Structure 1
Amino acid sequence: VKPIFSRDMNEAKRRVRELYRAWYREVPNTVHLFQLDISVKQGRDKVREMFMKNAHVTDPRVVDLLVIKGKMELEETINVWKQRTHIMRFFHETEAPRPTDFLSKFYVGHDP
């Protein structure tokens, strides 16, 4: 199939690393500009966590699309198009912890 930006996973992994460097070097500015009440480590760990969620992906086309969406998210953060509400949406705080144990799920509700 026709590629999007890369023809090999190695080429696709290169763009992921480039995005990570841009994201990693942006977190100190994001905390400073948005006046976040978190630490630089928390944001950088959060960036790592979101990258690690899409770690099982093997199709280079999907990898390119994820980086394309990754750059779009970074542009909003750099340009302060996002707000403190948008930035802190990754750090789910109002959401109560949902246990993943069967017995805990059994006690709560009919959730399969």
Structure 2
Amino acid sequence: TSVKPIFSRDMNEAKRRVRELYRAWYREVPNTVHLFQLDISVKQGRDKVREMFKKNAHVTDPRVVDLLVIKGKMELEETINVWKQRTHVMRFFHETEAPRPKDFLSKFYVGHDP
């Protein structure tokens, strides 16, 4: 049960790193909308950043959220630098995908998937 830390000794330093990564994304989103000339607003991109951070809001393991912060900083460095194109930024917005059936009844109608 004694493991080796990655960056965070406990959850509080990990939450500090999550918080600074969220600050850096919140600052970066207007420049991302500008220089990629995305057709979305700044509020929509920031709400997508909030959606991606709250997708991982259930983790209580410091090493796992350390690796999540490492991968998020990697995506941030790929976005600050122009390494992604417009396609790699807009893959966070599943625009061309049709909305999946949510309730039981429409999934029963269209197919076999639970």
The alignment's TM-score, normalised by the length of structure 2, stands at 0.97
Per-residue CA distance 1:72-103 (angstroms, 9 max, x = gap): 00000000100100000000011000021000
Provide the residue aligned with 2:94 in structure 1: 92
TM superposition shift of 1:42? 0.3
Runs of 4 or more consecutive aligned structure 1 residues displaced over 3 Å after TM superposition: none
Structure 2 alignment gaps of length 5 or more: none
Deviations 1:17-61 (A, max 9, x none): 000000000000000000000000000000000000000011000
Give the whole-Å Cα distance in 2 for the aligned partners of 1:80 and 1:56: 31
Q: Distance in 2 between matches of 1:22 and 1:80?
A: 16
* Rounded Cα–Cα distance in structure 2 between residues aligned with 1:56 and 1:80: 31
- The 2-side partners of 1:102 and 1:56 are apart by 25
Unaligned runs of 5+ in 1: none
- What is the percentage of aligned positions where both structures have the same residue? 97
Kindly tell me the number of residue pairs found equivalent between the two proteins: 112
